[PDB]
Design a protein around this ligand. Sequence first.
Ligand SMILES: *[C@@H]1O[C@H](CO)[C@@H](O)[C@H](O)[C@H]1NC(C)=O
Lengths: 354, 370, 49, 51
Amino acid sequence: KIVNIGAVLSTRKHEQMFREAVNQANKRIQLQATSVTHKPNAIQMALSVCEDLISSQVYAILVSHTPTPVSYTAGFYRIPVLGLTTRMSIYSDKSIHLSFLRTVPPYSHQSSVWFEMMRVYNWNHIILLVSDDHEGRAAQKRLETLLEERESKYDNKRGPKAEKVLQFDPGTKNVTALLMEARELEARVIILSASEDDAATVYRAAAMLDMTGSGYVWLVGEREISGNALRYAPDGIIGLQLINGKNESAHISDAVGVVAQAVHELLEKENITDPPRGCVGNTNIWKTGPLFKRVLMSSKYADGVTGRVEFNEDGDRKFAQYSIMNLQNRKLVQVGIYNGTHVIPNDRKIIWPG
Amino acid sequence: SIGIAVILVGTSDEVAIKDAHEKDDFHHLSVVPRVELVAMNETDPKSIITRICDLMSDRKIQGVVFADDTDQEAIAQILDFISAQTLTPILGIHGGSSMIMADKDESSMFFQFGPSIEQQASVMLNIMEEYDWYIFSIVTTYFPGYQDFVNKIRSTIENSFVGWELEEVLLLDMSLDDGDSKIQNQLKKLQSPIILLYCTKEEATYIFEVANSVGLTGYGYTWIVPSLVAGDTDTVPSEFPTGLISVSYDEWDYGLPARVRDGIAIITTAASDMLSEHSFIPEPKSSCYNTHEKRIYQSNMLNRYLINVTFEGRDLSFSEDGYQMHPKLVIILLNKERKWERVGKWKDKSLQMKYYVWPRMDDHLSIVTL
Amino acid sequence: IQNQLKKLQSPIILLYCTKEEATYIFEVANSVGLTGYGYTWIVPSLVAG
Amino acid sequence: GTQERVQNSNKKEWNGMMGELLSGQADMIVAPLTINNERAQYIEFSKPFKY
Ligand SMILES: *[C@@H]1O[C@H](CO)[C@@H](O)[C@H](O)[C@H]1NC(C)=O
């Protein structure tokens, strides 16, 4: 009885790191490695994985760049998954994927950079914008979920305001009127977290009517400060990015390490039946699939390359790090953020719009 | 070109044979349904897609009807995934592939049978009203949905001139094993007659086992629960007390034949309207996965004309999101026989109960006037 | 007992018990949570003694 | 200003004047405007500029 593990998609530059990690275990329960490359027209990509990975009685699955029905399939049989490099928050749910256990912050949870970039300068007035899709709808729900706090339990303390939000479609058409409802208001702190192709269109339509001058203060999210954003935006913005980001291998080590760190805590339950071997012809459930998925919610080792791996209640990465960006004429300055939880300054030339 | 099928998969109800040809008014839909009624054995996701796609590429079915008999709460999403890049209207019917699934992609066309939690909550309010006691505290767990559950009350507890009230909207947290001193202490602060709930069976038995240790399960209060505790409708974990009311519907109303007749009627009435409003019909695509050249093609928008359609009779209208517009549910009182009765029915904002006055499980009397 | 006395409302409560009996009844009270601020039990010497 | 449950949806909505403010249209209401218990919930009033 040797335990196995396998990748999913284009991790071709990593086929040796997993094996080196596997060797790095019994010298730190026989272990191996396998992999496959994804293919277009994902319909067969769903089927093409079972008789190769769910055949060998797998114990985990590792994906990369829209993760396939590996989100769905491994849920059947209840195979715990620890994916990566995927962002769209739809996987936040606990009832659309039985064990999706991500290792990033999902683009919603980047709320608290804002609420920690505003409650240090004593501002209290805002506006907001989101576009008709689930991700921001969560981000909207996220932001309106936190601002209830900071209330008076210390002995008559007060907090900020949550002025009239807006809504709009993915926006093939003009946005003026919607914006026209916002101009005459009495605030400037604007947020807008939709997407690259959305941000470009909205800036392209917003620079026409001069609501985009001085006094305004923008705190924009990740996928709106890149792509076509640099082709149409006027500067002053405060963009966000992660300290590892779109990378290759700074993280498979963390994956396999969290995997291996629990195997000693598993083998003392006298109920260590495996998941079945062979995708075709299975109708039961490995009665320790959700259990093996849940006990990973307590893996505590900081020795990762990007150390301190620890998953939130939703099982996504917690206590991450970001990069407080900024756009000048064409430059992109940086200051370091949170030290994990606080705020720390770094000498640079902060300008405001105008 | 549009094939139509019925695919019962692995149960004890191979009954759909002698009944699918009493719908002979579909020549008014000007299309003949290629009614292939395959019936597969027990099927696994590999085999699931195997059979489904083999048929969709040979029997070439441009609208299907599923059924199953199991507590597998994920199968429907697999078809949703199939329906996405294949563009297939699909109607999961029996318990299982028709269970409540909240958020799917925006491009597919896969629908279902059963009530979304919005209706499954509004009927709760109509129950409370009809018998003249007005809403009291809510109790909740972190299971997904609540951020869309409490809103449906707090947008109907208000837009009604009647005298609603409210109590402490609690919010627990369970899977911490060190905070057992922080759940009993959270549920020891309720003094109201009626109490909702929204959780899953694992947390359900746990709360009731700890609630019974708080003073809220015996005589005087009447816990009510939506359909998620309405699962395997034969269980009585000892911590459950009597009187527990709910709402659901599994089989007592419509049998599989008319149910699958319901489905064939739906799909064929759809095949009527668009193909009678116009004269353009979908195309026989080559394959579902191994095209390798037919991943790039055009798409059509029939998935709009399946909203306002009936059975030449009762309203079988459908949403754009997907659930039965005016669904047919029941109401069940957990008897002291450890079974589940039938003490109501709902249709177009109505309530009719086998009881006039609610019974007990005598400070209540009955006096006569003139 | 755990549910027999949960309809008490009056901001005062008397009592008559003994030490271990008292401790049990008080743990029950906490498990129902009806001994916070406002209720003021009043017990004779057999608990003081 | 009253609370008329307009048809086609049994939902409360203020009407005319006392609703022209809460709808963000108006900014301030100087009038013979009365002081009941109903309106005092949503909008805040001055002191009594008469009796
Ligand atoms: C982060 O900064 C805070 C500021 O007080 C301080 O505690 C420490 O320098 C850093 N670490 C933590 C854990 O706060």
